[PDB]
UniProtKB/Swiss-Prot annotation:
Disulfide bonds join 26-115, 28-44, 43-95, 49-121, 50-88, 57-81, 75-86. One of its GO terms (cellular component) is extracellular region. It comes from the Eukaryota. It catalyses: a 1,2-diacyl-sn-glycero-3-phosphocholine + H2O = a 1-acyl-sn-glycero-3-phosphocholine + a fatty acid + H(+). Binds 1 Ca(2+) ion. The keyword Secreted applies. Monomer. GO terms for molecular function: calcium ion binding; calcium-dependent phospholipase A2 activity; phospholipid binding; toxin activity. Snake venom phospholipase A2 (PLA2) that shows weak neurotoxicity and medium anticoagulant effects by binding to factor Xa (F10) and inhibiting the prothrombinase activity (IC(50) is 130 nM). It also damages vital organs such as lung, liver and kidney, displays edema-inducing activities when injected into the foot pads of mice and induces necrosis of muscle cells when injected into the thigh muscle. Has a low enzymatic activity. PLA2 catalyzes the calcium-dependent hydrolysis of the 2-acyl groups in 3-sn-phosphoglycerides. D.russelli pulchella is synonymous with D.russelii. It comes from Daboia russelii (Russel's viper). This is Basic phospholipase A2 VRV-PL-VIIIa.
Length: 121
């Protein structure tokens, strides 16, 4: 679920998902169009694609379980949708952590009209 994803993000990065990531660049949060602004935004592009691969799942609301094996995220067994949603969220959280070195506050609340260009999934 979105709340679990937000907690996973905070655990990984120390940044509150809202507002550090919920309106970032062209792909973090609500919609998505255009060329990702930077590595962090690309994490969100891929995460959107990841959810897009699950038609019949409800990533915003469906809850999954995971644990920590030393610092590593291990998705625990639920329904197939739960497992797949968890793997999407795990990847994005790790991706945000990997790219904290280029996170830029100037991309928070990025205006929709600047999301120029195109990308397929």
């Amino acid at each position: 679920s979105l709340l679990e994803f937000g907690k996973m993000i905070l655990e990984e990065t120390g940044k509150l998902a809202i507002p550090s990531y919920s309106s970032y660049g062209c792909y973090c949060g609500w919609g998505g169009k255009g060329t990702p602004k930077d590595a962090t935004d690309r994490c969100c592009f891929v995460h959107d694609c990841c959810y897009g691969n699950l038609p019949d799942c409800n990533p915003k609301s469906d809850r999954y379980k995971y644990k920590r094996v030393n610092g590593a995220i291990v998705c625990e067994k639920g329904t197939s949708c739960e497992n797949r949603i968890c793997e999407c969220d795990k990847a994005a959280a790790i991706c945000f952590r990997q790219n904290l070195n280029t996170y830029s506050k100037k991309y928070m609340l990025y205006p929709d009209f600047l999301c120029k260009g195109e990308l397929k999934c």
